[PDB]
């Protein structure tokens, strides 16, 4: 593949989540996340010129916003100090979120915590089933499903 195709794929994935909110200001994100559980998150467009996307997340100390860098074909969280080998970066922005949700299943300066999305709209029943299946198993090619639906499951492997 080439980069334009991998990025197209990542954005199509993002459009499947049900928790990509499009144009949404800082204040609107704050109002939506005010009373939400810690770790509730959504992705929206960044109003900054150098970034496509921003994560809004309910923290310990209230809602905040972390821009998502896209560099050398991969998404990574904005960081104030980094070591390249230490910062998780993925072709897929949903993969990046899913990685940190999986990491955070195990539990002064605020700590990042990501748990559950804040849906802007209800995903399709097909996609919701796919999420549930992904939470049940990583091995879908042995399931009693026609291969057309195994292909469907393969298009979106994440648990969020």
């Amino acid at each position: 593949s080439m980069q334009a195709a991998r990025l197209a794929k990542a954005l199509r994935e993002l459009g499947q989540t049900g928790w990509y909110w499009g144009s949404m200001t800082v204040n609107e994100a704050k109002e939506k996340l005010k009373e939400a559980p810690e770790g509730t998150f959504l992705i929206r467009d960044s109003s900054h010129s150098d970034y496509l996307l921003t994560i809004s997340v309910k923290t310990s100390a209230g809602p905040t916003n972390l821009r998502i860098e896209y560099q050398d074909g991969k998404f990574r969280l904005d960081s104030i100090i980094c070591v390249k080998s230490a910062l998780a970066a993925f072709d897929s922005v949903v993969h990046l979120i899913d990685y940190y949700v999986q990491m955070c299943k195990d539990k002064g300066t605020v700590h990042l915590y990501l748990t559950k999305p804040l849906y802007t709209s209800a995903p399709s029943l097909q996609h919701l089933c796919r999420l549930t299946i992904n939470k049940c198993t990583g091995a879908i090619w042995g399931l009693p499903l026609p291969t057309r639906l195994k292909d469907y499951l393969e298009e979106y492997k994440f648990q969020v």
């Binding site: 209230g62 905040t64 904005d78 104030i80």
Partner: peptide, 11 residues
Amino acid sequence: PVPDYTSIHIX
């Protein structure tokens, strides 16, 4: 309260 915009620091 946390700032509106933040960035990460892996400790």
